[PDB]
Design a protein around this nucleic acid. Structure first.
Lengths: 97, 97
DNA sequence: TATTAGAGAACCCTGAAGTTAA
DNA sequence: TTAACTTCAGGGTTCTCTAAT
């Protein structure tokens, strides 16, 4: 008998989360930021993205509450403590390690 | 210093993997298949998907080698024994209760 | 820095046509 | 022919880049 709507939107929510990290540059980003804070320019040069490209990706990450931000004058420092994230990265490294 | 080209593609491979299961109905599907054989039609009625839509989702799953199958006459029984699949499922359950 | 618009491609449906086995 | 699937064809929606003289 079909699935109840409750496991439809829990699936929806889980899927929104995954879609948030289901992209190569975005995974590079989450890995680097889960293990150290850094400025956006440094990040763009680390993961090989133009500044605008990277800003958009980060916007998607913020959209799912997967990163936080800190301001030092002109510069913005990104980092991550959503451990949903690092459960997924853990699983992933287990898989390809 | 930038990230080496290799973490660009292990990130791409992981990301392909994740994209394959980054869709609500595709997680309902994966769970259900993660262990019980059932018919393509049966699946379609459990996750509320047309016979055609579902066949396409299952193809996207096959694309990443996430499901196995056996044939009983006309009927096709899908299952999943990809452990990658089910550890990401583990992470998900850990995250959401 | 974040934001926008645009191109080109991928996504995910619907509903018609193909394939395979009884 | 019928049944269970799959694929094709289409179109609306969503991604992710570049350009911003």
């Amino acid at each position: 008998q079909p699935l109840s709507p409750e496991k439809h939107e829990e699936a929806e929510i889980a899927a929104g989360f995954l879609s948030a990290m289901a992209n190569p540059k975005r995974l590079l980003i989450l890995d680097s930021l889960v293990k150290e804070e850094m400025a956006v320019g440094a990040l763009a040069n680390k993961v090989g993205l133009s500044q605008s490209a990277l800003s958009q990706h980060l916007s998607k990450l913020r959209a799912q509450n997967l990163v936080s931000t800190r301001r030092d004058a002109q510069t913005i420092y990104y980092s991550s403590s959503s451990d949903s994230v690092m459960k997924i990265l853990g699983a992933l490294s287990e898989i390809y390690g």
